[PDB]
Amino acid sequence: ASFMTSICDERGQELIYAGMPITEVFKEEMGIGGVLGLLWFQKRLPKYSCQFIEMCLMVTADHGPAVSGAHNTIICARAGKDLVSSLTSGLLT
Amino acid sequence: SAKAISEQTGKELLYKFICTTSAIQNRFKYARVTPDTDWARLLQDHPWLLSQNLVVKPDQLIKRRGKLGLVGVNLTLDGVKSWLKPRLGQEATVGKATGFLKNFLIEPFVPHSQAEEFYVCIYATREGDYVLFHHEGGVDVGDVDAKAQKLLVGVDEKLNPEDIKKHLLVHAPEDKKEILASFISGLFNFYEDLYFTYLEINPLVVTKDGVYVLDLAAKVDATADYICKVKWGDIEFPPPFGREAYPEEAYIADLDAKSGASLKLTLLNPKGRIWTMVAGGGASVVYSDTICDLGGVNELANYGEYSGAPSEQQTYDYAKTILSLMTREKHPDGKILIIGGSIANFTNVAATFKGIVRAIRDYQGPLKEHEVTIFVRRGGPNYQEGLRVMGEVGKTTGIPIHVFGTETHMTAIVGMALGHRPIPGKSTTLFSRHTKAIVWGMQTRAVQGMLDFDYVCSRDEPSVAAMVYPFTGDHKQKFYWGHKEILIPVFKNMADAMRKHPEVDVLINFASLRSAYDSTMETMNYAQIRTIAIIAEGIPEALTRKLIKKADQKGVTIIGPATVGGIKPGCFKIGNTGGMLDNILASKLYRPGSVAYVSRSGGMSNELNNIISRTTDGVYEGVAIGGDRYPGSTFMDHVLRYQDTPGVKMIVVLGEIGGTEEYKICRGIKEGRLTKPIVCWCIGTCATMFQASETAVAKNQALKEAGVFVPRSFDELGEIIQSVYEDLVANGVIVPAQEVPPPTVPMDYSWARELGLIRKPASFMTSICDERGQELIYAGMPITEVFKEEMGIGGVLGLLWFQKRLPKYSCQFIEMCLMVTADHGPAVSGAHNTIICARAGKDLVSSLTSGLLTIGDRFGGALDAAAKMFSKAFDSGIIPMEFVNKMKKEGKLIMGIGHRVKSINNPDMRVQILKDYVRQHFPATPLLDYALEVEKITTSKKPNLILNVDGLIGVAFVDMLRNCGSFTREEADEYIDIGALNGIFVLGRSMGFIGHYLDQKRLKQGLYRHPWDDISYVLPEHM
Amino acid sequence: ASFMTSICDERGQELIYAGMPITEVFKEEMGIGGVLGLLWFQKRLPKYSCQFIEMCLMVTADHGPAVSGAHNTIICARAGKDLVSSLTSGLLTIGDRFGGALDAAAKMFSKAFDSGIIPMEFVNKMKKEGKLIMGIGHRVKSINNPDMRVQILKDYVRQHFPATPLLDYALEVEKITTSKKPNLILNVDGLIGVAFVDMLRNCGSFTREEADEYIDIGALNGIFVLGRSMGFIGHYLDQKRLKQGLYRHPWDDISYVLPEHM
């Protein structure tokens, strides 16, 4: 096999993340903070850190528009182009 | 492989690099004479030619010049020229051969007496380097072998001058002793430093004036260039003295040069009904035996070796040369082309059948009307696609072929061709079944062939314990033990693999020929390595004797060089011997039998597996000792192991012409040491039919008179093996094994794709470049043609993007379009957000890119909007007044037209340069003669409405793609509608954006946050 | 002023590059190989290097489609998206394992040229410290059969540059390396990163303390981007023409490894 991927599982009845099927993910309350640890680390995370990594996403959402990445998302959003091509032109900062 | 060099080049290599105390007279005093002799230039070279008498003599590897009357002695310049009048360009019948004397040499005559003529000769043997001296020389020296002073000098030694004084000069005159010891002790050092094998000087003249050299005959080891090629400088090897070589043979010898293969063509009778296409260094000798043995010797045309598995195109070139020699004129009998042979390394099975098929199907006209009846036989893999394509092209063309299989013997077709039958310290046990091995080098195919063979042999453990490869980092490699994936560790220095693995006792060098000596001398220092195979061919013969010397000082048995390795079925396989399992399961090599073979050539190990599998129970062990001059272990060592082995019941020996390696079998049986039934036959009886006891005929006859079961020729070899084995069964000697089916692995995909058993479609379909091959090819053109002509970036662009080659007036134009759109400026949305992500410290790619995703529908996409507007309105027939009136009525701005500053009174200058270049060079410009009317009809209302450069490039590419030499309108709409003309802007402006990244990385500027003075925050107030 | 840009000049009658107005650029024959040196370096370049840097763009245009950048331009061109977004998705592969052999060969040969090491101690320390030489090594080819592109570039370097240090150095390292294995040749990725070092030193108008800076910034990295971008616009445009559908990878090539705790 050429690739060796160790996170998801396309085929079958249910989609499976790193260990867990998705009806178990919504059966429990995993949250985005648990799906994040479940995709990236492949280790299932407890609730006090599951809520913490949601804190780290809720904090770094914006610092502002006069900031180098948001500046060159503003510019390539004014130049009329897509959502992907306007996100991206601020992500490579 | 030890080739000869000329007398001249030999003397210049002597004079340039000998170093001794007693000086040598006449340094660099010689004259090469051709039929292209500029006597003026030579006489300007050598003013001493008008000074003393001369000796002129040929330099073409002609032995006994002094008795053919071909040595002009004691002549002036005019006398030399008159002596060259009846000879240069003429012919002489010399010995048996006949050729043109086309190269002569002139040397100074210096007088000498008879007792001053000495004899020196230095050659190589397996145990060392002889020195032969004799006090009398001349052409009347006679047989000088058993009549001189010999001195043995051991391998990797020096030469003590006191020993020469005490042993090599016992008959020399006294006053001439010390200078000769001043000479020979120098000369051997010369002999060692340039890797000669045979250096003979007769006569050697020492007068009172000093030492000077008259004659020189030399042979150098041609595989030893990678040390000595600076010393050698330019070296030319001359052919033997025969007829002139055709340019055909030069064209095939050129295939030896630039390739890595080996394929030489020696044709001797162009008007014969027997031809050859023989793969393998061994099997060409076998066909040349059997053809001449069946009395068709007068109709044999060529014999040619072919090995190394070259590319399909080189085998196409070889086959088109031989088929070009086929179809010259008619003989009324009909020509028989024999195709087939024996290879050990099956690597290009899919490629080589694509050559010879393409060579046959490119001559179906002439090959029928020269009446060719081809016999093709396959060996090794069951490559059914090649057999099928041969069988289809034989019915399509009409050429009578007869493609055969493995069931017919490899010389059974020769009897089917010539009208004879119808057409239907030391060890004894090297390898146990608990033998480990360490593979040097990285040969994942050969190691996979190890492991799959071992799983077929129902072996408990693998046989590759570890790999060693010093030019990467330490890691592990993932292989297939049957069905489960196991790992094998790959090391860098050998101490890791020899301390972590105390279980190995065999190492297998798959080194290159440059590193085999060094890796083996690295390995020999260790203890448990008790068997070394050396796969690589072309190891120089001075290095091989050093390996044999230390192999005898340590006891390690060497199987090689130039082998492919042996095979011991049920226990262990080496290298690629026996091929892939597609051959193993057919020749039944997964169980032990009771027959052992041993061969000179490694190519014949497939054929002996074939023949011993089709007559007897199976091979016990068969070892190819390699095809070099110095084997690591000859016949007799493995024959003694086979004699001291219980499971062996009969022994087969396959020899070749050359050497005393076969008379030791006669001595071993006449001494009674070798008891078991021995069947031998050495290849090459009809080498004499194109030293006397080392001929293949006399060696076979001496084996036949001493109690070795020799067949009458090679074609009775299977019969005589079968007839010995029947008598071995019918006397209670061999109790045969009940054959049991083996386990079965799946085939490799990468191997069973080449054979054509698997058929899946290609996922991508790319139509521009071509990675593989000798040269990289763009859409049609190879790159040496791109630089051979002057294609330019403007031509490589059209050659990649369109796949249509473009003429020069547009090739220069598209360079104009890149030189214009390189920059418009830094306060421009793309360059702005390249400046920002270049100040934020990131890469070149990540700063180019952050400006490239601005290109789109408001920035830089005016080009492909101008094309899709003017070209859309040109085709609907609208004359520009209704065009401008509908652009007002429907209410949309014209995408080509409009500029911020400039008017008719002051244009852009870039639009004037592009417009002038368009008018001067394009043959016909519609749609710009249209658009310049739209300038006037628009600009009579406001001055600043001009078609821009963003309008004119999108117009002139429409006009160029229509009115170039090679497109169609229905195709030149497609490169507009895809967005190539959009993409001319990306490639244009990317020069500028790499410029802005690079510039503001140079002007070292910090992180950029925008001011708060420019941003008007509007936030809905619900806290 | 917030920005400080030192290449172009928007306003005025004519557009001006770094020194030259454009009617002088087309008045003379500057070429793309001269506009390149005029934008990037701001130093005007003579003709024998102006034609050379066009050689370096004509060589690195394509190596092929089964190559990591061209692969993920083929994929994002089959997924139906733009020219910019299909070029770009192959450009962000350029980096430290693909296409960044150029600026590693320059920063190796030019770093070892200045410390005075004659090539034997250079090859011996590249064995001892244990790192592969970034210019040298090829998959197929030997002394007996070179690349042809490296022969065309080497012949153009010898026929026209007035003095070539650091390539007379590196061709010695070919021989001292290649006498051990045949396939160790300095590549085209090594020779471009050598000949730009030699060109920036031995052009008419630079200094060594300044011609170190365009190497260390990564211009010589950026010659590869501009070279290969012709090829990637080629692959986008070609597989938009050969109208091919969305591409998902097969399941036959991917070995799923998932920790089993359901």
Ligand SMILES: COC(=O)c1cc(Cl)c(O)c(S(=O)(=O)Nc2cc(-c3ccccc3)c(F)cc2F)c1
């Ligand atoms: C490298 O040679 C192979 O790749 C190979 C593969 C198989 Cl399968 C095989 O059987 C043999 S062979 O030497 O045994 N017979 C044979 C030989 C040539 C040939 C091929 C090239 C040149 C001259 C003759 C040929 F065109 C057809 C044949 F059947 C050889």
Ligand SMILES: Nc1ncnc2c1ncn2[C@@H]1O[C@H](COP(=O)(O)OP(=O)(O)O)[C@@H](O)[C@H]1O
């Ligand atoms: N320069 C020379 N001066 C004197 N005699 C020479 C010279 N060159 C050749 N000869 C004569 O020619 C002979 C050399 O020919 P050579 O090839 O050695 O004959 P052969 O092969 O039979 O030994 C010597 O016997 C020598 O007498």
